[PDB]
Amino acid sequence: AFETTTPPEPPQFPAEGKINYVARDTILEFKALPSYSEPDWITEKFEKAGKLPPLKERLPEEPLVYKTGNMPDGVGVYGDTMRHVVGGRPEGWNYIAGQSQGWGGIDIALSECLTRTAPLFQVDAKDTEPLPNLAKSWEWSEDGHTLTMHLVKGAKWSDGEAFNADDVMFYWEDAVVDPNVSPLGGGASPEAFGEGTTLKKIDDYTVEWTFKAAFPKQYLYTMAYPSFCPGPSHILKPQHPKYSKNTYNQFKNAFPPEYMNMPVMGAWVPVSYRPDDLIVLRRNPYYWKVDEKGQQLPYLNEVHYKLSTWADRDVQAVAGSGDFSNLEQPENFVASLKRAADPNAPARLAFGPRLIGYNLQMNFSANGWGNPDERGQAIRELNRNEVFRQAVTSALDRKAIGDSLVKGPFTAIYPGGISSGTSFYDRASTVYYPFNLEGAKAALASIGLKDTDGDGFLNFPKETLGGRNVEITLLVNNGYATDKSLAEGLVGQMAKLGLRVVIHSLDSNQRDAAHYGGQFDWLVRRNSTELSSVVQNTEQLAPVGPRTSWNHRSPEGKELDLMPFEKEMADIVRKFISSQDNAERADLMKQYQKVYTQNLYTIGLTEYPGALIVNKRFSNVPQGTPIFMFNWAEDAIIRERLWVAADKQGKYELFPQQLPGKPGEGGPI
Ligand SMILES: OC[C@H]1O[C@H](OC[C@H]2O[C@H](O[C@]3(CO)O[C@H](CO)[C@@H](O)[C@@H]3O)[C@H](O)[C@@H](O)[C@@H]2O)[C@H](O)[C@@H](O)[C@H]1O
Ligand SMILES: [Ca+2]
Ligand SMILES: [Ca+2]
Ligand SMILES: [Ca+2]
Ligand SMILES: [Ca+2]
Ligand SMILES: [Ca+2]
Ligand SMILES: [Ca+2]
Ligand SMILES: [Ca+2]
Ligand SMILES: [Ca+2]
Ligand SMILES: [Ca+2]
Ligand SMILES: [Ca+2]
Ligand SMILES: [Ca+2]
Ligand SMILES: [Ca+2]
Ligand SMILES: [Ca+2]
Ligand SMILES: [Ca+2]
Ligand SMILES: [Ca+2]
Ligand SMILES: [Ca+2]
Ligand SMILES: [Ca+2]
Ligand SMILES: [Ca+2]
Ligand SMILES: [Ca+2]
Ligand SMILES: [Ca+2]
Ligand SMILES: [Ca+2]
Ligand SMILES: [Ca+2]
Ligand SMILES: [Ca+2]
Ligand SMILES: [Ca+2]
Ligand SMILES: [Ca+2]
Ligand SMILES: [Ca+2]
Ligand SMILES: [Ca+2]
Ligand SMILES: [Ca+2]
Ligand SMILES: [Ca+2]
Ligand SMILES: [Ca+2]
Ligand SMILES: [Ca+2]
Ligand SMILES: [Ca+2]
Ligand SMILES: [Ca+2]
Ligand SMILES: [Ca+2]
Ligand SMILES: [Ca+2]
Ligand SMILES: [Ca+2]
Ligand SMILES: [Ca+2]
Ligand SMILES: [Ca+2]
Ligand SMILES: [Ca+2]
Ligand SMILES: [Ca+2]
Ligand SMILES: [Ca+2]
Ligand SMILES: [Ca+2]
Ligand SMILES: [Ca+2]
Ligand SMILES: [Ca+2]
Ligand SMILES: [Ca+2]
Ligand SMILES: [Ca+2]
Ligand SMILES: [Ca+2]
Ligand SMILES: [Ca+2]
């Protein structure tokens, strides 16, 4: 019915990075050093005064050592604060039970994971093994069904309690496996680690994975942020319903934002919270990472998270009051570029490849996900109809969508699927449905949708919902001008096609609950890592498990109502996960792209590049860091390795020469 082609090549984007490509093992290694050091005030006021054990006793026998060769500016010096600005708000500290701490890097810094992938933008390959983090090493069995994983040994939580296999086991059994606990991010279901996957404790520093498939090496990426980042089991386990009288909601909410010094494996500990104002973190004296000179990380003593808006983060970063931003909203591009064009500018700004994409996602569950009413059920049936999807995508004037955000070479025609900025992308495999409003109108008439009351809006046939007007709800994230502008643009374009679309605008926390609970017809969403990188959270590319897909999940308790193209996509993704053949993997992503875009698994709105904004006083910021690839730039830049030269340091510490207090107690000690 439609004359499909490939999407047109966008304008050339001059100077992205450039990235200084390195080999995987140039960044870090685990080893003992001859001696260790720390800020002088810790030795004088805490160690010598009895208050803390000497540094060597606090560290693992073999800490994680950052290699000097990979440091952009070399070994650092202690001091200063990194000031972040966020549009989110904390719910509390229970990350593994699905509570947000405010986004914008806070949970990334607090909740460290088994592996780490964000700094891998500097390795020029897509078969890179994730960096060891809380898991120091691992080995595959000969048959590839068993993965023996060795943990960092001798590391402690920020309160001095030992980190070991008990924390790993508690997260796996009582958060992942437990169907009443869902970690933050919408992922981390048991099937995200493979169907029938088991994890068992061997000893205090050894765990063992058992996989149905042979060598599913892709799951090492799933073990990084956000899906395998354990909480302090000694604090959380006594609050869990399996070991107490608490309900699941009581367990989820047992650590509100007012609860101080929540134990972490991260470089800084939350010490202060003021509603709608600020979160202050102070250096963790038990941090288990050091530089090659034996200096215990982080270099920065303090981190701030100013509670504001996402657009204010850009404003503060270019003004110099904020130290970091991911410039990701096109309506802020011109003003940010103008302010950064001044040679006296306090911050540096650098655009990367086109990795920020937006999709229209349709709820594909016709078997009760989100318990829809008669109206909602009739929309699910239209969403599952391929002619309806072809009409919706063909009624979009993608050039006009791009123009509505920003002029210039930023936007690209985006039909959906894998981002054009990543190496697995193939233009020839991308099905583009050009703007054909007349063809879209004929396609809807062919499935029995026609305006029977002269109001310009299409009615269902008399057999469905008494022949009333089709009414579609659109779930939108209220925190971003981009999301809201795209939603408004979509409503106008659908009105021309004859479909009535109603915006349901919600704040982040409520938006995530409505989405993951399946309480939506359609939604507007910025793409997560699987479309920007393929290799990070690959399970999110298709409904490989009952809850791995963003738009097709099963209600509890029920199975998936997969359409044939979705089963073909699930098969491609599972084959990719267990393949170590580069040529086969590239071919599988071409087939994946083709099936996705031909069948309209989602409908692309637009795609463009973002820019990293960092205050100039910071040393060790890697060149060409993208804002979003394997993770957000807050992770990729390795904040625990950043430093400021003594003569350039700001004097912004709110708790200078202080360390975190005890969990559930007072302010910094
Ligand atoms: O956390 C660092 C990040 O914070 C801000 O974005 C947070 C954003 O996260 C969620 O949105 C996405 C995109 O749809 O969903 C995946 C998984 O949760 C995230 O990777 C991705 O951002 C929430 O659904 C949003 O409500 C929430 O605001 C900020 O925009 C980023 O630049 C970066 O600082
Ligand atoms: Ca284009
Ligand atoms: Ca390498
Ligand atoms: Ca090499
Ligand atoms: Ca000192
Ligand atoms: Ca001893
Ligand atoms: Ca080196
Ligand atoms: Ca050096
Ligand atoms: Ca200091
Ligand atoms: Ca400071
Ligand atoms: Ca931020
Ligand atoms: Ca074997
Ligand atoms: Ca040890
Ligand atoms: Ca000990
Ligand atoms: Ca845990
Ligand atoms: Ca679970
Ligand atoms: Ca198990
Ligand atoms: Ca098997
Ligand atoms: Ca313990
Ligand atoms: Ca109980
Ligand atoms: Ca309960
Ligand atoms: Ca409950
Ligand atoms: Ca709950
Ligand atoms: Ca309750
Ligand atoms: Ca709470
Ligand atoms: Ca914690
Ligand atoms: Ca607040
Ligand atoms: Ca207040
Ligand atoms: Ca106030
Ligand atoms: Ca030194
Ligand atoms: Ca505000
Ligand atoms: Ca915008
Ligand atoms: Ca520019
Ligand atoms: Ca994106
Ligand atoms: Ca169909
Ligand atoms: Ca344009
Ligand atoms: Ca233009
Ligand atoms: Ca465009
Ligand atoms: Ca291509
Ligand atoms: Ca009508
Ligand atoms: Ca009709
Ligand atoms: Ca538009
Ligand atoms: Ca199922
Ligand atoms: Ca299947
Ligand atoms: Ca590969
Ligand atoms: Ca510098
Ligand atoms: Ca560099
Ligand atoms: Ca300040
Ligand atoms: Ca407290």
Description:
It is classed as transport protein. The entry lists the keywords Periplasmic binding protein, transport protein. There is one protein chain. The longest helix has 18 residues, at 582-599. A hairpin with a 2-residue loop joins strand 8 (198-203) and strand 9. The protein has a domain at 355-610: Dipeptide-binding Protein, domain 3 (Roll), CATH 3.10.105. Helix 11 (386-394) runs antiparallel to helix 13 (437-446) and helix 17 (564-577) packs antiparallel against helix 18 (582-599). The radius of gyration is 25 Å and the shape is globular. By secondary structure, it is an alpha+beta fold. Helices cover 25% and strands 17% of the residues. A five-stranded mixed beta sheet has the order 18-17-19-16-20, sandwiched between helices. A four-stranded mixed beta sheet has the order 3-13-11-10. Strands 6-7-9-8 form a four-stranded antiparallel beta sheet, covered by helices on one side. 52% of the residues are buried. The protein binds a molecule of 3 linked components (FRU-GLC-GLA) and calcium ion (CA) (48 copies). The site of one calcium ion (CA) has 3 residues, from loops.
> How much β-strand is present in the residues?
15-25%
Report the major sheet: 5 strands, mixed
Percent of residues in helices: 10-25%
Topology, number of strands? 23
Spatial arrangement of strands, main beta sheet: 18-17-19-16-20
Radius of gyration from the CA trace? 25 Å
The unique ligands bound to this protein are:
a molecule of 3 linked components (FRU-GLC-GLA), calcium ion
Going by CATH, the homologous superfamily of the domain at 355-610 would be Dipeptide-binding Protein, Domain 3
**SS content category:** alpha+beta
Global shape: globular
Specify the CATH architecture of the domain at 355-610.
Roll
CATH class category of the domain at 355-610: Alpha Beta
Note the gap between the termini. 71 Å
- The CATH topology of the domain at 355-610 corresponds to Dipeptide-binding Protein, domain 3
Please tally the helical runs, counting DSSP H or I stretches of 4 or more residues: 19
